[PDB]
Design a binder for this molecule. Sequence first.
Ligand SMILES: Nc1ncnc2c1ncn2[C@@H]1O[C@H](COP(=O)(O)OP(=O)(O)O)[C@@H](O)[C@H]1O
Ligand SMILES: Nc1ncnc2c1ncn2[C@@H]1O[C@H](COP(=O)(O)OP(=O)(O)O)[C@@H](O)[C@H]1O
Ligand SMILES: Nc1ncnc2c1ncn2[C@@H]1O[C@H](COP(=O)(O)OP(=O)(O)O)[C@@H](O)[C@H]1O
Ligand SMILES: Nc1ncnc2c1ncn2[C@@H]1O[C@H](COP(=O)(O)OP(=O)(O)O)[C@@H](O)[C@H]1O
Ligand SMILES: Nc1ncnc2c1ncn2[C@@H]1O[C@H](COP(=O)(O)OP(=O)(O)O)[C@@H](O)[C@H]1O
Ligand SMILES: [Mg+2]
Ligand SMILES: [Mg+2]
Ligand SMILES: [Mg+2]
Ligand SMILES: [Mg+2]
Lengths: 476, 475, 167, 57, 461, 154
Amino acid sequence: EVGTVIQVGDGIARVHGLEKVMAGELLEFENGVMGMAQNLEEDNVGVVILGPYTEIREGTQVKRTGRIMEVPVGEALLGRVVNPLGQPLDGRGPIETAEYRPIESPAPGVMDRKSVHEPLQTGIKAIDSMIPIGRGQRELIIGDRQTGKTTIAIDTIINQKGQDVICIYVAIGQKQSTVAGVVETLRQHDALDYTIVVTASASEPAPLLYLAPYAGCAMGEYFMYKGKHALVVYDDLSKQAAAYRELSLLLRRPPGREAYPGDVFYLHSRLLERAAKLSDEKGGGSLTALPFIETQAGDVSAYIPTNVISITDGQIFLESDLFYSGVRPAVNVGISVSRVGGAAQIKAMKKVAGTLRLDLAQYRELQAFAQFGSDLDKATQAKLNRGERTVEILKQDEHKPMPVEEQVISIYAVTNGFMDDIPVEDVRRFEEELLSFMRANKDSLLDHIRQTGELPDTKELDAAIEEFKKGFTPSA
Amino acid sequence: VEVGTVIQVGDGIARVHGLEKVMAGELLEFENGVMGMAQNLEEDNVGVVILGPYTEIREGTQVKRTGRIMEVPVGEALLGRVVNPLGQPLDGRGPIETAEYRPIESPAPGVMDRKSVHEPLQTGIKAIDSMIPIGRGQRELIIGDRQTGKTTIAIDTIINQKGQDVICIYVAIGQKQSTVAGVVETLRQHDALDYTIVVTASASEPAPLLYLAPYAGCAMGEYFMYKGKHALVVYDDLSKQAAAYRELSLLLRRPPGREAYPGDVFYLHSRLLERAAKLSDEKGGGSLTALPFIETQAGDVSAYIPTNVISITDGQIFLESDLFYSGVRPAVNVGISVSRVGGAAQIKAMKKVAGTLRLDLAQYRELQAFAQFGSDLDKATQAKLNRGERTVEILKQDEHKPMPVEEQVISIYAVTNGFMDDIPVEDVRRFEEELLSFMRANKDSLLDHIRQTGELPDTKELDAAIEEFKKGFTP
Amino acid sequence: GDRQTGKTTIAIDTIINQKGQDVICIYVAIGQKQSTVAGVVETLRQHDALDYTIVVTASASEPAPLLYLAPYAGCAMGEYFMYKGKHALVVYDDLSKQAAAYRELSLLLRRPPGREAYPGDVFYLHSRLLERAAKLSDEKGGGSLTALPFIETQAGDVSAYIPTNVI
Amino acid sequence: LLDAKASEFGARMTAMGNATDNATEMLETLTLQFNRARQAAITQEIAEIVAGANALR
Amino acid sequence: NKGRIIQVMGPVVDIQFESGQLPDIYNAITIERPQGGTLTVEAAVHLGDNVVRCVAMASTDGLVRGLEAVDTGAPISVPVGKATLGRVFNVLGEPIDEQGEVNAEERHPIHRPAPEFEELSTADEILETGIKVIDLLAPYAKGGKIGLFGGAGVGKTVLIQELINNVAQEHGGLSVFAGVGERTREGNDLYHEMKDSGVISKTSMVFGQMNEPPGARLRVALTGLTMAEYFRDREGQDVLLFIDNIFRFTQAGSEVSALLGRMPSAVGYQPTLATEMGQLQERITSTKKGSITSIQAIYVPADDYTDPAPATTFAHLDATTNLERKLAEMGIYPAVDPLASTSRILSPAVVGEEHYRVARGVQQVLQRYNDLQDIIAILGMDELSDEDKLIVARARKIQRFLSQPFHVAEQFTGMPGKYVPVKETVRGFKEILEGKHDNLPEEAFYMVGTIDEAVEKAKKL
Amino acid sequence: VGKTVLIQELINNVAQEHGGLSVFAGVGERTREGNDLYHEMKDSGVISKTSMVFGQMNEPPGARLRVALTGLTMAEYFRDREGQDVLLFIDNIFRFTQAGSEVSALLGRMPSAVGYQPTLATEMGQLQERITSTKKGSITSIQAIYVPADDYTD
Ligand SMILES: Nc1ncnc2c1ncn2[C@@H]1O[C@H](COP(=O)(O)OP(=O)(O)O)[C@@H](O)[C@H]1O
Ligand SMILES: Nc1ncnc2c1ncn2[C@@H]1O[C@H](COP(=O)(O)OP(=O)(O)O)[C@@H](O)[C@H]1O
Ligand SMILES: Nc1ncnc2c1ncn2[C@@H]1O[C@H](COP(=O)(O)OP(=O)(O)O)[C@@H](O)[C@H]1O
Ligand SMILES: Nc1ncnc2c1ncn2[C@@H]1O[C@H](COP(=O)(O)OP(=O)(O)O)[C@@H](O)[C@H]1O
Ligand SMILES: Nc1ncnc2c1ncn2[C@@H]1O[C@H](COP(=O)(O)OP(=O)(O)O)[C@@H](O)[C@H]1O
Ligand SMILES: [Mg+2]
Ligand SMILES: [Mg+2]
Ligand SMILES: [Mg+2]
Ligand SMILES: [Mg+2]
C-alpha cells in the first residue's frame, strides 16, 4: 500500500493516501529512508522522517510496513555502536539478529514488580554510601556542564566488569567526536564487550534524538524480560526534550511553558517507568536507569529538571562551587537523595553509612553558620572535625573504582573516630595506606564482607585498624 | 421565542445557531430547563455560557430566548438566608418570599448623585478604625497572602454592625463550601446572621456563577441604598472572580493579554465597585460600603489583578505574613496601608487621638533599627522606642472581639498620653482590658459623652479617672 | 547614556564645529518631540551651521514606519556626498526609538517576538545602517560618511539588548 | 585608653559609613537586575500565552 | 449507537456519529483494536457536523481511521461496596491484582454533582498523627481535608506513607488509596506494605500511574473517589481517602487541553483549571451521612507555590503541610515549613490554651531567627544583642526538634521511627522556650522523639 | 500632600496674571473624587476658569483611552483661537497608557515588552506632541504619573 508526499520541510512530511495506516506505524520512503506515522488526519498523514531528507520531495512515494515502530535487539548489539534505528555506525558490518522489540512499550504494572533490593555498585564511595543505587532503580544525574556527570556513568559501566550486567550508553545530542572518545575509553578499560552504544549525534534530525532513549530502553528491556540485569544511561534528556520541542513546534502543536509541549512530562515519565525490578514470577530481571539533566547556573528548580526529579527514585546533584573547591566527585549532599536507600546496599554498608547523608547535610549547614562568628563550644567543634574528615574520605579520583568491602572499612574507620587524631590533609593517604594494609594482611576481614554482606566482628576490626595506625607517620 | 439549535458544546460553553434577534447579555433557556447567558453575538452563531449542568446539552438541543437581562430577587426576605447568585436558597429553609427583583447589571450613581463620605463605618478593629478609617460609601480593598487574616477582618466588621442598622452582604466567590458553612455558623453564634445576606458561588459551580456572584450581592445591597438605608458588601474574593471571567473569555476565544486575562478584566471590577457609593441628600442619603478582597501570591502587589483593584478603590489594608507570625494580629501593615477618605470617616474624638498615634508609630518605625542597642541610646530615642512597643501592643487585638469606638478612643488616649509608660510591655494588653471594664462599670458618664457628642470628654476628668484605675492595677 | 545626560548637545556642537571644514552634516531626529527639533534648527541657524546641514525628522506623533525609515533616508542623503569624494557626518538621534518603532511594526505583522519583544532581525536593522558609513579607498574617491548613532539607556543599563547590539 | 576609644569609634563610624554606602551601591545594581527579571517574566510569559492561542486561531 | 474514527492525534480521537445519535459528554465509548483488545475512550467536546472529540483512557497507537466505535450510553462506571475492599483497580474499575472478578452488587458512574450546601458541616476535632511539626503547628482535623504540598524530592510520598502507618493501622473505618500519576514502583511497595500489616483488607486501591496516557491520569482519581462516596453515603462510615498525587489530575487536564482546542491560560494551564478542580474537590468532603478524612499529596512545579496548580489547590483545604527544599537540604525531615503550614483548628478553642500559646511562641522565635539570617551572614553573630543570641540558640534547637525519624523511613534515616503524642510534643517545645535545655548541644535535638530522648542523646556527645 | 490645592492654585494664578484658562482631564477618575474635586473647585472659585472632563473608572477602555484627547481639544481652542497660555492637567497619564493596553488586547494585537500594547510609544506621541507651544500661544501640561512596581524603567 502506497502514499505520495504532498509537502515536506525540516524533516516533516504530509502524505496523501496510506488510508489504512496505523498511528505510530513504521513507513519506508522510495529511497529506503524510514519514517513514522505520527498524525492521522482526516485525509492526510503527518510523517516524521527518521533519516536524511534531501532526496525526499513532493511526489516521493511512501510504503507502509504494517509494523509498529521497532528496533533490533539482542546479544549481537554488545560491543557495537548503533543509531536509534539499530543500524551499525562503527563500520564493522551488519548486526546478525533475529529478534526485534517495539520502541513504545507498556511499563511493568503494579503487580509485575518487586521492591528494589540488590546493589548496583558504582565503585564511587560518595554514591554507594550516601546515594545508593539499586537494580531496577531510576537515579537522575543532574548538574551544570563540566561538573562530572558523564564520568560518573562511565565509571559505573566500567565497574560492572564481570558482574554480569549489560550496559547501554545512549548519547542524545552530543558531538560525535565525544561519543567516539567515550567508546575508546570503554575499550581501554575492557568494558566495551558488555556495552551497547546508541547515538543520535547533534547533526541528526530531531526525531532520531527524540527516539534515541526509547531505542536504548528496548535494547535493555530485552535482557530484563529474560531474567538478566541491565543498565541504561540517557546522556542527556535535556537535549531529547529540546528535540521533542523542535518536533512538536514543526508540527504546529501549541506550545506551553518555555515553548515545550504539554506532554513533555509524559515524554520522560513513560521512558523511565519502563526501567524496573521485576517480580520472581516474571523472571527477577532488572533494568536500572541513569537519566541525565543539564542545568543552567545550578537551577534545579527549572521546569524540565523538576519534571525529571519528580519521575526518578532520587538524584545525584553536582555543583561547580564544590568541584572547584576540591570536592570531587562534586556531590551536593543536601539536595541529592536515594529514595530506595538502605534496601540497595549490603548490610555492612547500610550499618556504617546509615545516617551518613543526614550527618553531612547537618555538617554543611553548621559549617556555613560557624564562619559567621562565635568561638564554638566543644560539642560542635568535634562535629565539624569529624565532618571535614568524612568529606575527605568521600573525595575520590576519576576512573578509580573501589570494591564495596573496601568502602565499608574506610567509612567504618572515619565514622568510629579512627582518624580523629590524624591531620585533615593526611586523611586521604591514611585511607590508601590502610586499605593496602587490609588487603595484604587482613584479607580474612574483607572477605567476610564479600561473602556474607555483613560486618565482621567489630572488636577484631577495631584491633586491625589500631594495628595499622602504629605504622602510620603523619605529615604535621 | 424563534428558537435556536446547539452547534457545539464543551466545557460549559455552547455555540448556538439561530436566535437572530437575541440581546447581548440575555438570559436563555435550554430545552431541559437549564439556563444560559448570551455572551458573544457572532457572525454565524451565538456564544452561550451555561449556568448549570451541561452533560444533557448536546448538538441539536434547542434554546429559547427569554427577552430578559439577568435579574435577582431582592429585599428583606434575604436577611439570614444563604443563596446562590441567582437568588435560590441553598440553606434548605424553603423559598424566599419576595415580590421585588433588581437587575444584576445596573448603572452606578453619577457624579451629581453623590455626597462626600462623612459617616463612620466602625470595623471594631483598633488598627483599622484609627489608622485606615472606613466610611459609609467607601470602597476599601483588603489585600494580602493566603492565611494573613483577611476573612476574619470582614467577619469581625459584620459582627460589629450588630444594632447599627447596617445590612451586611457576604459574597463568597470560589471558596470551598465547607468554609462558607463555617462562616455562616460563626455569624450565627455572634448573633450577626439576622441582618446578613450570604451569596455563594462555591468552587464546584460553573464559572459564570463565580463571575455573577459579586454583581448579585451588589444588587442586594443597592436595594437598601436606594431606599435611604445603609449597607455593607464583602467580595471574598475578586481574584477568583477574575479567574472565572478569564476561563469564560478564553473559552469564547477572546484575545488574551497579561497573565491571559482579557482586555476588559479591569472594567469587570471597576463597574462593580463604582456601584458602591454615598448618595446625596436629594437621592435619599443611603450608602453602600464595599470591602473587596485580593489574594496576592508571595506578597506580589504589583501583579495585574491586584494593581487593577488597588487603582479602583479608595485605599487599601495590606496584611503581611511576617507581621502575622511575629504576633502582630491583626497583621496590618500600617505604614503602607491607606484610607483616601481619612479623617472625614472618623468621629472627632478618634481623629484627635489618632493624630498622635500615627506620628508616634512613624517615629517608632524609623528608630526601630536602634532597638537592639537598649540603654546605649540617648534618653529621647529610648522613650520613643518605649512608647512605640506599647502602642503596637494596643493595636494587637483578639479575633472575633470588636471594640466600640468610645472604648477605642479611651484606650488610644491612654497609651498616646503616656499613661502606660510605667507599665511593663508584657502587661499592656491586660492593662487595657482591665481599664475598659473599669471605665464601663464605674466611669460610664465619660464613655457616654463620646457616644453622644462624638467629642473627647474634659481631659482633666479623663486623666484623673485613668490615674484612679492605675492605683488598683498590679503588674 | 540616560535621558538628559547631554547626548544631543554633543552632536549639535559637533555639527557647529564643522563650519568651514567642508563637511556636510545630517541630523536625523527619530521619535523626538518636535519642539526640540525646532529648537535644534534654530540653534544651528544662530551659529551659521544650517547652510551645510540637512535635517531629517520623524517626530513622535508620526506613524511608526516613518520612524523606521528616517535613519536610512538620512544615510542615503549623506552617501551621495561620500560617493562623490566629499565628506559627510550623519547623526541618528536616536536608534532606541527607531528600534521600538520597528518592533511596533514587526508585532503588527505578527512576526514572532524575542528578547524584550523585539524581532530576531532588530540587530540587522542597525548593522546594515551603520555599515553603510565608511571611509572609502583612494580608487573609490576617498570620500567618507561618519556616523554618530544614539542609544538611550534606562538607569545606565548598558547590558540591555538594544544597547549591546549597537555597541 | 580614652584616645584609643575615640580612635575605635572614629574607625567604626567610617567603616560602617562605607558599608552603608556600599550597600546603597549594591542596591542599585540589585534593583537593576530585579527589574530586568520582572520585566522579562511578564514579557516572556505573554509571548507563550499568545503563541499557544495563535496555534488555534 | 455506532461511529467511525475520523482523526487520531495523540490521546485525542475524533469520532463521527449519525445525525442525532451523539453520545452525551463524559460517556464511555469502546473501539475494538485491530491488534485485539478494547480501547475505552471518553466523550469531551461536540465539534459539530456530528463529530465528538474524545479523550483516550489508553494508548491510541495502532488505531486506524474508519474503525467502528460504540457508545456505551453512560459514563465510565465502576464497582462500589465491599467487593472493592482488598482489591486493586485501574481507572475503568477492572481489577489489576489478578484475583478474578469483583462480585459487586452496584456499579456507579465516576462523574457526579457535588454534595449540596445543606449536607455539609465543619471538622472541629483533632486527629493525632504522632508527627511533632504537624500536631503542634498545623494539626489535622478528623473528617477534614488535608494537603501535603511539596516540590520534587522533598518527602510527600514518604509523609503520606507515614500517615498511613501512624493513623490507618488503628483506624475503625474503611480506606481508599488513589495513586494518581506517580511512581509504579511506589504503588508496588505500598501494596506489599499493606498486605504484610494486614490493613489491605480494610482498603480499596486504584492506580493510574505516571506511565499511563493523560486520559487515565485525568480520571483515575474520580474512580477512587466514587468508591469512597459509597462507603460514606450508603454505609455511613468514617473513610480515609489518600490521593498521591492530585496535581497529576490537573496536569493531565492541561495535557489534553491544547488538543481539545481550548486557548491556554497563564503558565500553559487549561483555562478551566479552577472549575475542573472544584468539581473534583467538592465531592471529597464529609457530609451528614458520613465522614471522609482526606489526605492529598500536592506537587509544586519548580518549587513555586505561586504556580496556578498549587495556588488554586489551597482553597480546598482545612490544614496544610508545606514541604520546602531548603529544610530538606539541611537534613530536617520531615521538611515542613513551620511558618507556611497552617490549620483551621490551631486555636485555643480546639487544642486548648497551652498548646496554642506554645505553638505561637515557637513560630515567633522562628520568625525572628529568619529575620536575623541576613544580618548574621554579613555582620556576624557577636554583634547581636543578648536577647537575640538567645533567640537564635533556641530557634536552632526548635528547628531540629521539629525533625523526627519516620517508621517508614527506617531505610533512609537508618534509625528506628518514633510516634510522639501531642501532650509530649507540647511539653517538649514548652521546655525549650522556657530555657530548660539551653546547655544541651544542637545535635541532641535532631532526629529524636520526646524531649527525654534529647536529654539522653546529649549524654552520648 | 496638596495635589488638588496646588492644581487649583495653578489654575488661579495662570488665570489671574497671564489670563490663561485651564482644562482638567480625569483619566480613570474615581467618581467619588470627581464629585469632591467639583465642589472643591466651586468653593475656591477656580471652577469658572476651568473645563473638566472625566473618563471614570467604571467606563470601558475606549472611554478612558480617549478622554484625555477630549480635554486636550478644548485646550487647543484656547491656545490657537484666543492666543492663551493654557494649563492641561491629566490625572493619571498612566491610566491613559493602561487603557491603551486594554483596548490593544481586545483588538487582538500581539503584546510588546512587559505586556504593553505594541503602539505604546506612538499612542503617547499622538497625545504629547499636541501639548506644545506654538507661535499663537502655549499649552503647558501637568500630569500625575503612576509608576508600576516602583520601576522607573517600566
Ligand atoms: N572525580 C573527579 N576527579 C577529578 N576530575 C574529575 C572528576 N570527575 C570528573 N572530572 C573531570 O571533570 C571534567 C568534566 O567531566 P564530565 O564527565 O565531562 O562532566 P559533564 O558530563 O557533566 O560535562 C573532565 O575533565 C573530567 O576528567
Ligand atoms: N522523614 C524522613 N526521614 C528521612 N528521609 C526523608 C524523610 N522524608 C523525606 N525523606 C527523604 O527525601 C526523599 C524524597 O521523598 P518522597 O516522598 O519520595 O518525594 P516526593 O516529594 O517526590 O513525593 C526520600 O527518599 C527520603 O530519602
Ligand atoms: N486577629 C487574629 N488573632 C488571632 N488569630 C487570628 C486573627 N485573625 C485570624 N486568625 C486566625 O488566622 C487564620 C487566618 O484565617 P483568615 O481570617 O481566614 O485569613 P485569610 O482569609 O487571609 O486566609 C485562621 O486560622 C484564624 O483563626
Ligand atoms: N556642556 C553643557 N553645559 C551646560 N549645559 C548642558 C551641557 N550639555 C547639555 N546641557 C544641558 O542639559 C540638557 C540635556 O542635554 P541634551 O544634550 O538635550 O541631553 P539628551 O539629548 O541626552 O537628553 C539640555 O537642556 C542642555 O541645556
Ligand atoms: N498650601 C496649603 N496650605 C495649607 N494647607 C494645605 C495646603 N495644601 C494642602 N493643605 C492641607 O492638606 C489637606 C490635603 O490636601 P489635598 O489638596 O486634598 O491633597 P491631595 O490632592 O493629595 O488629596 C488639605 O485639605 C489642606 O488641609
Ligand atoms: Mg557529559
Ligand atoms: Mg479568606
Ligand atoms: Mg536629546
Ligand atoms: Mg511522590
